[PDB]
RNA sequence: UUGAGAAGCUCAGACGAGUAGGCAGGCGUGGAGGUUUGUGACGAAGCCUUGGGCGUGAGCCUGGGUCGAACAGCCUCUAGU
RNA sequence: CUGCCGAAGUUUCCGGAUAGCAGAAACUCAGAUCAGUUUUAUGUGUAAAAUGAGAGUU
RNA sequence: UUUCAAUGGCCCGUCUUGAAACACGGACCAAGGAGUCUAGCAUCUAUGCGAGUGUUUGGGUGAUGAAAACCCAUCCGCGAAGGUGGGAACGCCCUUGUGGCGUGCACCAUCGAAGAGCAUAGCUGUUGGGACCCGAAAGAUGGUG
């Protein structure tokens, strides 16, 4: 599996997702350190995904792996995620950031969707105030200083421009913007305390 | 009034006496440190090995 | 009066190929005879220990080996050194012991005179 | 006078590229200090201690919070004190020794790249100095 | 606006004697590892010539005549330079 | 081969150690000190206004 | 390019001398021709490691030069044996700026009593070594007629 992704032709790294299709749709509780060691096979299936056509259809595919995952280990996927791509900003080099921006963009997008599927089952304000505590202890946590600010720069900006587009009629009163608001607060890094209301396109008109 | 030059000639050997030991102690007391100082084994890189 | 050290590649290897017609002169006896374990008499580097000349006579007829055979079956004989601690002998018996337990010896045919 | 490094540490040509950037489109004082200090030739740049370390951020009043200290310069450590505490460090070079003590027992080293896409102008961070007399 | 050999490009102002001496950047010779998938009997090296150029300069490139078997630019190494 | 800086040419003690000039580095300051400067005034010196220059150390 | 016209310009190097005067050295051309090689010391810089540091005495090894490269055993060398203020940098502000409140490196004042080397290469300096090159009667040993 996890060698396969990260294969030097696309006609195996494709394969490698399908063949992931029954693997994240399994019917069992899987560890944190399983969701990290696949994560880094999946970092690097988008690393070389060349074409700007397809390594934008990719990220679509990868933003589709959220709600076919099992309902209870969905959290901890997506919290893989944002830790295995908070270590690894680092590692990538101009040419590479315009895809995990917009993958970063996709996923950021897929949370929000998956509360409004959840929303339909279970009360919105558990569900949201759960993702919210996925913001408290993964990428907005005051206590790890090894997170880099692009990214959080990044979610302020397309955070409530993709809640517009999960919610296209109107967005119900949540606390949506609860991280960036336990951020600017308490965070210990204050260039991004200071500037991330500046690049935040907060709105309380609902919430 | 003191003891006697070739005397104190042994002075050196009660100073030199315990080069060899004290050197040798310190070529295990550095690798003792070296086997409790080392970085962890770093789970996340046996994904491809 | 000045020296290079230009052979000290060339004198190496004259040292290995040395070693080497001396292994295919002798070739089931090691190229080096067996010494033993005693300590530099020096209040420096007493508590070491390194290797001797050769094994006593107390260190050879205690392990049980004559002092006559002892030159043949490559244990080399040192009548300077003495035993004095007991510490000494003990390092230097059971090293002639772990010898003859890893030592094959080829018999040699022998004079049998028909009468006696 | 001193405005190009006499190194040839190929890298060390990319920091202070970065720094060089740094130090003249922003107006903090940490960065123009950053990049006068990678010019310093290596006598100029002592080796600061684990413990000299250690005992800075924790000095007098303590309440280390959880600021980074930063030093051009390598950083040895110290087998005379056994208990390391928490420590986030950002230096040019680090000791084998010393680095795998910061990150077995607290927090972590940086080097100066990214301690920079941290505080670009130096924010909560300790600018400190080995002993220069030696 | 393309002007990132960031060791680049660009803007402004003042200044310019020189021994002893201090500092810096370069030019040139023989040979050495790399390189130019370099040049050469359709003419290498050399040589002469009021041929043409290049550089403040050390020096360099080229035309013609002789000539006949080798030679060079670049990055470093090196010295009986 | 070109480019930059460029003295001293002598005090002072005593063949010298100093110094000085020139540099080379490290420092701390221009909200600080200065000047082969000039005034003001107190008793030619001294002390405190202008004119200029960033000045001082190891 | 040769030549002419007008304006000009005391032979070069050394040494001497403030300066010259000088006295020297120079018939002409080609080639040869003089801070080099090395051990020691100190300095500056560069690199590797850093309370450590240094494979090359030697051993292991090296099938395609094998005097290279590559690897490490036992030594060994050289190291290792607290308050006050001024201060770099940063945060909090807040009449903002101004500044204050702080935390205070290197270091300096003060009161006082949390090691930075080792090895290689270069540069300049210095001491030896034939010691930048050339030039003073030698003297001594041993021979020749």
Same mark, same amino acid.
């Given at each position: 599996?996890?060698?396969?992704?990260?294969?030097?032709?696309?006609?195996?790294?494709?394969?490698? /997702?399908?063949?992931?299709?029954?693997?994240?749709?399994?019917?069992?509780?899987?560890?944190?350190?399983?969701?990290?060691?696949?994560?880094?096979?999946?970092?690097?299936?988008?690393?070389?995904?060349?074409?700007?056509?397809?390594?934008?259809?990719?990220?679509?595919?990868?933003?589709? /792996?959220?709600?076919?995952?099992?309902?209870?280990?969905? +959290?901890?996927?997506?919290?893989?995620?944002?830790?295995?791509?908070?270590?690894?900003?680092?590692?990538?080099?101009?040419?590479? !950031?315009?895809?995990?921006?917009?993958?970063?963009?996709?996923?950021?997008?897929?949370?929000?969707? *998956?509360?409004?599927?959840?929303?339909?089952?279970?009360?919105?304000?558990?569900?949201?105030?759960?993702?919210? %505590?996925?913001?408290?202890?993964?990428?907005?946590?005051?206590?790890?200083?090894?997170?880099?600010?692009?990214?959080?720069?990044?979610?302020?900006? +397309?955070?409530?421009?993709?809640?517009?587009?999960?919610?296209?009629?109107?967005?119900?009163?949540?606390?949506?913007?609860?991280?960036?608001?336990?951020?600017?607060?308490?965070?210990?890094?204050?260039?991004?305390?200071? !500037?991330?209301?500046?690049?935040?396109?907060? @709105?309380?008109?609902?919430? | 009034?003191?003891?006697?030059?070739?005397?104190?000639?042994?002075?050196?050997?009660?100073?030199?006496?315990?080069?060899? @030991?004290?050197?040798?102690?310190?070529?295990?007391?550095?690798?003792?440190?070296?086997?409790?100082?080392?970085?962890?084994?770093?789970?996340? *890189?046996?994904?491809?090995? | 009066?000045?020296?290079?050290?230009?052979?000290?590649?060339?004198?190496?290897?004259?040292?290995?190929?040395?070693?080497?017609?001396?292994?295919?002169?002798?070739?089931?006896?090691?190229?080096?005879?067996?010494?033993?374990?005693?300590?530099?008499?020096?209040?420096?580097?007493?508590?070491?220990?390194?290797?001797?000349?050769?094994? !006593?006579?107390?260190?050879?007829?205690?392990?049980?080996?004559?002092?006559?055979?002892?030159?043949?079956?490559?244990?080399?004989?040192?009548?300077?050194?003495?035993?004095?601690?007991?510490?000494? /002998? %003990?390092?230097?018996?059971?090293? +002639?012991?772990?010898?003859?337990?890893?030592?094959?010896?080829?018999?040699?045919?022998?004079?049998?005179?028909?009468?006696? | 006078?001193?405005?190009?490094?006499?190194?040839?540490?190929?890298?060390?040509?990319?920091?202070?590229?970065?720094?060089?950037?740094?130090?003249?489109?922003?107006?903090?004082?940490?960065?123009?200090?950053? /990049?006068?200090?990678?010019?310093?030739?290596?006598?100029?740049?002592?080796?600061?201690?684990?413990?000299?370390?250690?005992?800075?951020?924790?000095?007098?009043?303590?309440?280390?919070?959880?600021?980074?200290? @930063?030093?051009?310069?390598?950083?040895?450590?110290?087998?005379?004190?056994?208990?390391?505490?928490?420590?986030?460090?950002?230096?040019?070079?680090?000791?084998?020794?010393?680095?795998?003590? +910061?990150?077995?027992?607290?927090?972590?080293?940086?080097?100066?790249?990214?301690?920079?896409?941290?505080?670009?102008?130096?924010?909560?961070?300790?600018?400190?100095?080995?002993?220069?007399?030696?």
């Amino acid at each position: 599996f996890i060698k396969k992704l990260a294969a030097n032709d696309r006609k195996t790294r494709d394969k490698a /997702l399908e063949s992931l299709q029954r693997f994240l749709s399994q019917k069992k509780k899987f560890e944190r350190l399983d969701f990290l060691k696949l994560w880094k096979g999946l970092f690097y299936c988008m690393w070389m995904a060349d074409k700007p056509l397809y390594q934008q259809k990719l990220s679509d595919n990868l933003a589709a /792996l959220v709600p076919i995952v099992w309902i209870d280990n969905r +959290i901890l996927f997506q919290s893989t995620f944002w830790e295995t791509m908070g270590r690894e900003w680092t590692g990538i080099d101009i040419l590479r !950031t315009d895809k995990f921006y917009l993958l970063m963009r996709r996923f950021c997008a897929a949370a929000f969707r *998956d509360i409004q599927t959840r929303s339909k089952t279970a009360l919105l304000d558990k569900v949201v105030a759960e993702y919210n %505590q996925m913001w408290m202890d993964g990428p907005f946590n005051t206590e790890n200083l090894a997170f880099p600010n692009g990214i959080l720069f990044h979610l302020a900006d +397309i955070w409530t421009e993709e809640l517009r587009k999960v919610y296209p009629e109107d967005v119900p009163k949540a606390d949506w913007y609860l991280p960036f608001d336990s951020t600017i607060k308490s965070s210990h890094n204050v260039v991004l305390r200071k !500037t991330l209301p500046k690049r935040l396109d907060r @709105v309380s008109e609902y919430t | 009034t003191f003891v006697s030059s070739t005397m104190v000639r042994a002075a050196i050997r009660n100073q030199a006496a315990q080069r060899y @030991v004290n050197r040798q102690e310190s070529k295990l007391e550095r690798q003792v440190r070296a086997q409790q100082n080392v970085i962890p084994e770093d789970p996340l *890189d046996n994904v491809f090995a | 009066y000045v020296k290079t050290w230009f052979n000290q590649p060339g004198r190496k290897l004259r040292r290995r190929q040395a070693r080497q017609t001396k292994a295919a002169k002798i070739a089931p006896r090691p190229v080096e005879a067996i010494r033993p374990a005693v300590k530099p008499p020096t209040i420096r580097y007493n508590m070491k220990v390194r290797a001797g000349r050769g094994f !006593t006579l107390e260190e050879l007829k205690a392990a049980g080996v004559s002092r006559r055979v002892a030159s043949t079956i490559g244990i080399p004989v040192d009548h300077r050194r003495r035993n004095r601690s007991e510490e000494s /002998l %003990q390092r230097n018996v059971e090293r +002639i012991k772990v010898y003859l337990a890893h030592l094959i010896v080829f018999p040699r045919k022998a004079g049998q005179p028909k009468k006696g | 006078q001193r405005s190009k490094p006499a190194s040839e540490n190929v890298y060390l040509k990319l920091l202070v590229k970065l720094y060089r950037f740094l130090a003249r489109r922003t107006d903090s004082r940490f960065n123009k200090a950053i /990049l006068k200090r990678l010019f310093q030739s290596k006598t100029n740049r002592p080796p600061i201690s684990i413990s000299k370390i250690a005992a800075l951020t924790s000095r007098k009043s303590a309440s280390s919070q959880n600021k980074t200290t @930063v030093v051009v310069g390598t950083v040895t450590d110290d087998e005379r004190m056994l208990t390391v505490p928490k420590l986030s460090i950002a230096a040019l070079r680090f000791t084998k020794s010393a680095r795998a003590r +910061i990150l077995k027992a607290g927090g972590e080293v940086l080097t100066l790249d990214q301690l920079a896409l941290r505080a670009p102008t130096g924010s909560n961070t300790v600018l400190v100095r080995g002993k220069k007399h030696a």
